[PDB]
């Protein structure tokens, strides 16, 4: 419904970096 902690993991992984 919400998915509020679930979705800022998935968005973090599509546009990842390296070392943060």
């Given at each position: 419904?919400?998915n509020q902690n679930i979705?800022?993991?998935?968005?973090?992984?599509?546009?990842?970096?390296?070392?943060?």
């Open positions: 419904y919400t979705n800022i993991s998935q968005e973090r992984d599509l546009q990842k970096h390296g070392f943060h």
